[PDB]
Amino acid sequence: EWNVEKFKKDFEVNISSLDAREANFDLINIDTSIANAFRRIMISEVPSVAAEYVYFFNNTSVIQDEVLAHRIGLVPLKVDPDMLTWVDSNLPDDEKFTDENTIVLSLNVKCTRNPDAPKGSTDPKELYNNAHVYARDLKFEPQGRQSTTFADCPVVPADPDILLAKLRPGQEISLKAHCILGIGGDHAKFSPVSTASYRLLPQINILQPIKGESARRFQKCFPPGVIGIDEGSDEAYVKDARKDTVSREVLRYEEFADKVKLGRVRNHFIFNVESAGAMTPEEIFFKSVRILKNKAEYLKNCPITQ
Amino acid sequence: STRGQYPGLYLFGGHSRMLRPVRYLPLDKEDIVGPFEQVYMNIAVTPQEIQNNVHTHVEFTPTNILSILANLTPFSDFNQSPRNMYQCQMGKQTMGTPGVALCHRSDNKLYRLQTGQTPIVKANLYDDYGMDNFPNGFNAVVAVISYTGYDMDDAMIINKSADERGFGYGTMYKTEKVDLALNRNRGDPITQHFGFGNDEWPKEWLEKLDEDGLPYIGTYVEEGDPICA
Amino acid sequence: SSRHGQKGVCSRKWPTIDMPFSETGIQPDIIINPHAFPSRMTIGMFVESLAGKAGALHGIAQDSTPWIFNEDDTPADYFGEQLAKAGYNYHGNEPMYSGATGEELRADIYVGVVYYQRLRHMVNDKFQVRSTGPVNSLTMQPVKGRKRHGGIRVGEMERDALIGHGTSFLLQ
Amino acid sequence: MIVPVRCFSCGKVVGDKWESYLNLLQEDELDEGTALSRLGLKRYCCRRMILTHVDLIEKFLRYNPLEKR
Amino acid sequence: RTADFRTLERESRFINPPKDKSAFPLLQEAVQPHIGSFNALTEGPDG
């Protein structure tokens, strides 16, 4: 009968792909409540570091200050979120921002014209100076400790090339953004994942075999590599049901729709985690499981109140 | 015609005639027809329905019978008509991009959508009339699903994260005229001047109004705040 | 509103985790209840969903001019082939999982790409409340107009209705 | 207005791929499918985000009153 | 490929607005019945 150790015997992991930006790995023999729990946590509960309070001194752009501020919020920073603790609110602004709780980014760009580009329609980058405002203009402003602490992890936008704003000569932007620690549940800009999703393993139960040119003729009904045929005089097999997209195109044809059933494997989960660059996606998963555990420790630790 | 309209050949060339093109087949060239002569004219709606010895013209395109907005509405020929008319009321009442010279207009109100897109689905008259100059909406991933229990009858759900990424973010402009000539009055004075004199005013007004009596452009203003001095 | 006059208020800004997510790993932007269609028959909107989905995948604009299609060349067939060539359900549905629990729903959900437009009637602005305010001197009754924070009228029909209830102390 | 930072639906940052995509349609004279595929926009939420954009700011900027014209 | 995007054409038109003729001549032609009407009070036959 059930024990957590019989699950531990039954639970398996297979890691399909581990890139520093994507992890596609499978969890066989787990419960949906747990996979959905991790997915959900990976989205909402994993803390990330994002600009939060942008202090403008001037914005002469044709872009609205508020909108641009939201965009600076949207910018993902390549920052290990473990460099900072949470900032309370019970307390005054002078205590709110410290080098232990805040990251400062200054942006001071002044747009000019350039000294005379060839004809006339040269790329505004040729005709104008600082016409393109990129994430590369986020000046990192350390304080003391964190100046040293970031010696080998300076704060950079995970894509400096992101166009943030376009200016014109004499236009200028001066603002100082306050980047803090936040969770993707409180706002999507704090979500460290671009897409963390799971999908149940497609299962293709072939009820009676199909063969010959109907077997390859069926094979073209599925993604190239879902159905494998070794000889087809004897079988058309499923090379990998994981390749399928459940287009259910086979159902258009009775030639097959009467000797196969298409279901799923509740136990097998196909994770797809793409990271926004703030953290490597698997490490984000590590934090997600440590988060669920810390919550269970919190619930053990809590005294039942009444 | 037996008890018909009184016969005659009434030509008209004068002003205010409403005129519309149709393709005259015997000379295969465009001809301008008005509503009076149309009554007795056999205009096939498409070339394959041209009936022998009957249709003397054919429509260039059946879109020629719709107004501009009805062509902007995709597949309007697939929905119940009153839904197309409410489409005219919605798209016509839609907050979109009103212009681009908005920093040089001064309407009592303007509504400007910042996130504009070009429909994937459109009539070719969407390009031919250039409505792409002022896109009024956005292409959304929609699931037609009752699922949450708040999508019934007339209520629809948005992803919170989508708004958090700026989805449908919009702005509203209200323009104001601050006049100092309410009574303009006879004309022994007209002195009101923006600024101060008594010092006794709350100096916290400088937090909003510059030493010229006008607020700093860019200023956050809340109900109660002074808009000028 | 869609470009089809199927207008709706946003009832709620659903948490992303709680939204349904597709096997493509996405959660829709907008959810419209299907039960609106049987009366409205906004089937042009269905075709716009399947056309915007196809057209996003292959990455091209689709012409929606009235009568470009034919009873023997239905759009469901055109985009059925386009979408199915893309690698997607020929009918265009996709197996989605519950945001909340995570199970696969009974059936494949109809998802697509639809142009939605924001009506200027941001009914956010139409709220109003008055527990105290100005009164007309000719009545000592709440003044009129939102900017006067005036009070809504209890009309004759509402008078009638309160008399219906027997609620004479509420009517007084 | 301006190329959105992220795809509303997915969450993938897209704001970096505008200038490169437009360059790929001009410079590489590529087609929309192949260019967006080289950009990694392998989901139609990602596809639609950039594909439908109308960078209207270029029209706005000629109205800049802070420089003589 | 039926109603293709004029994307380069558009963005070029945004960057370098027309210097000789508006596109969308139907757009100018739509208010033609107004403007022409007003011109007949200042230019036309007799004056």
Binding site: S16, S17, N24, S197, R199, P223, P224, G225, R242, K243, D244, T245, I270, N272 | T46, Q48 | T24, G25, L57, H58, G59, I60, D63, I68, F69, N70, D73, Y78, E81, Q82, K85, A86, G87, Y88 | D31, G33, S37, K42 | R1, T2
Partner: peptide
């Protein structure tokens, strides 16, 4: 009437999560 033509580049642009045209 002639039916509107299907696109010429009607080709697979979608894969499962985990895959590419490296399997095509």
């Amino acid at each position: 009437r002639k039916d509107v033509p299907k696109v010429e580049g009607l080709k697979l642009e979608h894969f499962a999560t985990g895959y590419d045209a490296e399997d095509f």
